[PDB]
Ligand binder design. Structure first.
Ligand SMILES: CC(C)S(=O)(=O)NC[C@H](C)c1ccc(-c2ccc(CCNS(C)(=O)=O)cc2)cc1
Ligand SMILES: N[C@@H](CCC(=O)O)C(=O)O
Ligand SMILES: N[C@@H](CCC(=O)O)C(=O)O
Ligand SMILES: [Zn+2]
Ligand SMILES: [Zn+2]
Ligand SMILES: [Zn+2]
Lengths: 260, 260
């Protein structure tokens, strides 16, 4: 009976360093939605666990040439971690190599603008050129655009892939900062969950505009053949039914919201 | 190989009799979201299939005394069907006896009123007696209320379980017809998907009021040990990623709107 290695990612408000982390040990160093969720998954499934921050800071993409998976998906695939409890999007390319639980949170790709940017939709972005637009450089949002068979998203991808300087960002923080600094001339494509979060953070200068471009979810991911698979999945279901997932989202998004 | 027996339920706009169904045969008798979904899933998984409407007309619940499952769940449990492709809610008690794919559609419990009924929320319903309210029998909505420890919803359950005459209905159509014919004196608790469909149908005399009471999904269900499980699961993800699930939702909800 071993300590389960949990891979996760420093992404607010899912996992954050506590103020006093240097004075704390192990799992107590971290706080956030996924920290709370990991404690509950572990309790319901009856395992001890160790939170680990993904080494490369990435979510998980497979390199076209080397076929190597990076990020948290890589850590699962290569057996460096036993479970990923993180804002990790359920995707087909990932579900082909790892198992996901039923989604614990819903999201879709969305548009973040600096307040007062004349953009209402993904159509509005594709039709103009004054406002630059991009995504996280190594995640499911980028892959949505790259793998699309849909005309308008193919159009947006074609712009983004060739845009100079690069419209892609290394971290959500960088995307958000870029929106805040580009005086309305950069829009960021990111998941609605992160968009919603940032809209409630000081200095309250960004907002989600328009509908989501897709509808999907984050799931808890395990390597194929994990003994944790069934129990993790039932735990997610139990926690949803008991209202905990809604409670945790409110706790980390809205209850401490800085924008009124 | 073998023709896959698909259990489903006559529920608008998921599976409906075509207007000229009397002159049609087999699968061709039916149209709707789940009819289109079945066709797509069968195509991506490489099986032939026969749509069969669930004999007892129910979704599925377990008798507390006999432990026997009825409805589509029962048909899977007892080997009468190979797969359920229907607006079947993923729930813990079900996921313990059958497997669910990733959700193909999101929904939450909601309130339908006859237009002008002075009810805005579940709280409003709980605080009065003049307007009766109920749910579908042998479904997940009833179970939600049965199990809820939320004071508003427990108060509601306490009332509904004892209410005379019975506030529960056999079919969604019966719930909706009850709302329409009770002059505002009956409200109906049903899933947001069905509520929102009905709101856009003639005679446009109902509406959804308040927020959803929960957030969950419909899943394609297979009996435990099914050779279809993984392929069906991936097929749902492929269909979502292609935008096909979104296309089907628009086809059956909003393009089929009669209320403007
Ligand atoms: C990759 C996709 C195919 S998807 O699998 O993400 N679904 C796509 C479809 C559009 C969709 C259906 C339902 C949800 C949803 C997510 C989380 C919750 C909270 C609890 N989730 S739960 C217990 O599983 O119902 C409820 C609902 C999300 C998406
Ligand atoms: N949740 C995403 C990362 C964020 C994004 O791509 O926008 C993923 O799992 O790749
Ligand atoms: N979708 C529900 C039926 C409708 C309801 O209970 O409101 C089920 O699977 O039981
Ligand atoms: Zn620090
Ligand atoms: Zn718990
Ligand atoms: Zn297809």
């Amino acid at each position: 009976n071993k300590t389960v290695v949990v891979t996760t990612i420093l992404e607010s408000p899912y996992v954050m360093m506590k103020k006093n982390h240097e004075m704390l040990e192990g799992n107590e160093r971290y706080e956030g939605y996924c920290v709370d969720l990991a404690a509950e998954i572990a309790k319901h499934c009856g395992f001890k666990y160790k939170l680990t921050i993904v080494g490369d800071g990435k979510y998980g993409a497979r390199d076209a040439d080397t076929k190597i998976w990076n990020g948290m998906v890589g850590e699962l695939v290569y057996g460096k971690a036993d479970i990923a409890i993180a804002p990790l999007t359920i995707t087909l390319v990932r579900e082909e190599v790892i198992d996901f639980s039923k989604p614990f949170m819903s999201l879709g790709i969305s548009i973040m603008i600096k307040k007062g940017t004349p953009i209402e939709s993904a159509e509005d972005l594709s039709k103009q050129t004054e406002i630059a637009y991009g995504t996280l450089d190594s995640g499911s949002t980028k892959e949505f655009f790259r793998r699309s068979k849909i005309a308008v998203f193919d159009k947006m991808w074609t712009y983004m892939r060739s845009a100079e300087p690069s419209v892609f960002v290394r971290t959500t923080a960088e995307g958000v900062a870029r929106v805040r600094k580009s005086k309305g001339k950069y829009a960021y494509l990111l998941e609605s969950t992160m968009n919603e979060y940032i809209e409630q953070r000081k200095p309250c200068d960004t907002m989600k505009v328009g509908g989501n471009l897709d509808s999907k979810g984050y799931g808890i991911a395990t390597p194929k053949g994990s003994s944790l698979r069934n129990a993790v999945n039932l735990a997610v279901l139990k926690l949803n039914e008991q209202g905990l997932l809604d409670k945790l989202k409110n706790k980390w998004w809205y209850d401490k919201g800085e924008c009124g």
